Design a protein around this nucleic acid. Structure first.
Ligand SMILES: [K+]
Ligand SMILES: [K+]
Ligand SMILES: [Mg+2]
Ligand SMILES: [Mg+2]
Length: 133
RNA sequence: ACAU
DNA sequence: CGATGT
């Protein structure tokens, strides 16, 4: 109902889908960019959204921060909850890099704990997520 | 349909 | 318009 301003917001940007994928995380309150992932040559929107959330979890854990994460991605939120990114993207040589990162993100989820709430950014009510590209 |  | 997803 109300924005939790003491939070980290993430978003994916892409050139094509599948296409070049990047993501970033921002302080929801201030818009300060807290992390940005170097563009990945081929990936899907949902893989990027998933990697962004997981990176946020790792970022906040490293800093002993209990802030929640906002994502606007129904899909990625579910994939993180499940610890399983159910992407349809073909695994081939061109998609190897994104799939390695997705596999490693799943692996991290499966070997670490966190209490970070992962919250749906309610775009219909609040406008674009603050990490938007 | 909903979320991108 | 087409693509990624539940
Ligand atoms: K975006
Ligand atoms: K669809
Ligand atoms: Mg998004
Ligand atoms: Mg966006």
């Amino acid at each position: 109902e109300e924005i939790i301003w003491e939070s980290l917001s993430v978003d994916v940007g892409s050139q094509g889908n599948p296409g070049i994928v990047e993501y970033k995380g921002v302080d929801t309150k201030t818009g300060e960019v807290l992390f940005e992932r170097e563009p990945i040559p081929i990936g899907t929107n949902n893989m990027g959204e998933f990697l962004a959330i997981v990176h946020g979890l790792r970022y906040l854990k490293e800093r002993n921060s209990r802030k929640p994460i906002y994502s606007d991605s129904q899909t990625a939120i579910k994939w993180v909850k499940d610890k399983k990114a159910k992407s349809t993207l073909v695994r081939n040589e061109e998609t190897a890099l994104i799939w390695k990162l997705v596999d490693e993100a799943e692996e991290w989820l499966n070997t670490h704990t966190y209490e970070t709430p992962i919250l749906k950014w309610q775009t219909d009510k609040w406008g674009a997520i603050k990490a938007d590209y």
